[PDB]
Amino acid sequence: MVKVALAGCPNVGKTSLFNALTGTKQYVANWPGVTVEKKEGVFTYKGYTINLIDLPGTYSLGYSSIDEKIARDYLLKGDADLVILVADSVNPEQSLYLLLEILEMEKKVILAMTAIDEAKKTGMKIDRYELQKHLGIPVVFTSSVTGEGLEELKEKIVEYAQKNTIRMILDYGEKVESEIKKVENFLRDKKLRINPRYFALKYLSGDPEFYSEGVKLGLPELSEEERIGYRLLIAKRKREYVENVVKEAFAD
C-alpha cells in the first residue's frame, strides 16, 4: 500500500490528475478540527494499492492561512510515502518555487508537469532531462485531458516508493549559511521530526510554528527586522534558482 499526496499551487490541475487516477474510487471528508475538505482516493496498479490525498492549493508553505497550514501539516506530520508536485507546464514558475520548499523537507518527490497537452500547443520545448538534472527528482509529463504520462506516473510512483531514501541543497550565501550552521549545532542533541536545515530556515524566517518551537528548544529570540530579512533573502534565492531552472529547461 502506497500513500501519495498531491501538492501544488492553486488551479494547476491537482484534482483533474486525482480524478484521472482514481475515477469514482474517492470520497470527501474534512481535515481534523476544521471544515476544509479533505479529498482522498485509491487506485490499483500492477497489484499495488495506491492511496491518493488531494491537498489544498498553496503558493507557499507558511503557517498563517488555513490552506497552507493544512498542506504543510500533512507534508510534515502525515503518513505520505511520497509527494507528487503537480506543476502547471504552461506557467511553471510558481510551481517550481513551491517545489523547492518541499524538496527542502527531504521527502520523496516526483514532479508532474501537467497540462502538457496545452503546453505543447505553444510551441515551447520542455526538456525533462534538464528538469531532472537541476531538481534531482523524477519528472513526468502528464495530461488529464489526453492521458499522456498517466501510466508513466504510476510506474514512477511504485519505482520511487521502493527506495530506502530520497538532497536539494540551495546555497543561501555566507550570512544565512552561517546562521543555519549555528542553529544546526545548537539543535544537535534535540529530537527533531524534520531535518535541522529545514528547521533552521523556518526559524530564521520567523515562521509562526518553527520560530516558536525553536525558542522553546532554547534558541534565542530574533528581531522582527531580522526575521523579515531572512525570510526575504531566502525567498529571493529560491526565485533566482527557479529562474535558472526555467532558462536551462524551457525554450520557445
Ligand X SMILES: Nc1nc2c(ncn2[C@@H]2O[C@H](COP(=O)(O)OP(=O)(O)NP(=O)(O)O)[C@@H](O)[C@H]2O)c(=O)[nH]1
Q: Which amino acid is at 113?
A: M
Cβ–Cβ < 8 Å for 22, 49: no
Check residue 134 for interaction with Mg ion (CB under 5 A): no
The residue whose Cβ lies closest to ligand X is 57
Residue 146 beta carbon to Mg ion: minimum distance, rounded to whole angstroms: 19
Binding-site ranges for ligand X (CB under 6 A): 8, 10-16, 57, 114-115, 117-118, 143-145
User: Of the candidates 1, 11, 164, 191, which one interacts with Mg ion according to CB under 5 A?
Assistant: 11
Q: Is the dihedral of CA 14, 17, 21, 22 positive or negative?
A: positive
Place of cell 507528487: 84
Residues 14-73 that bind Mg ion (CB under 5 A): 14-15
| Closest-CA residue to 28 (of 17, 19, 39) | 39
> Is the torsion defined by CA of 129, 144, 9, 155 positive or negative?
negative
Cell of 42: 485509491
If the CB atoms of residues 14 and 134 are measured against Mg ion, the closer one turns out to be 14
d(CA 226, CA 248): 33
Residue ranges of the annotated binding site for Mg(2+) are 15, 19-20, 22-23, 88
Please tell me the number of Cα atoms within 13 Å of 89 on its side-chain side.
26
132 binds, among Mg ion, ligand X, none (CB under 5 to 8 A by kind): none
- Least gap, CB of 104 to ligand X (angstroms): 22
Of 115 and 200, which CB lies nearer to ligand X in the complex structure? 115
- CB of residue 8 to ligand X, shortest distance in Å: 6
**CA gap 137, 143 in Å, rounded:** 19
Shortest reach from residue 39's CB to ligand X, in Å = 9
The one segment of 3-11, 58-66, 126-134, 167-175 that binds Mg ion by CB under 5 A = 3-11
DSSP state of 190: S
Does 94 bind Mg ion (CB under 5 A)? Our answer is no
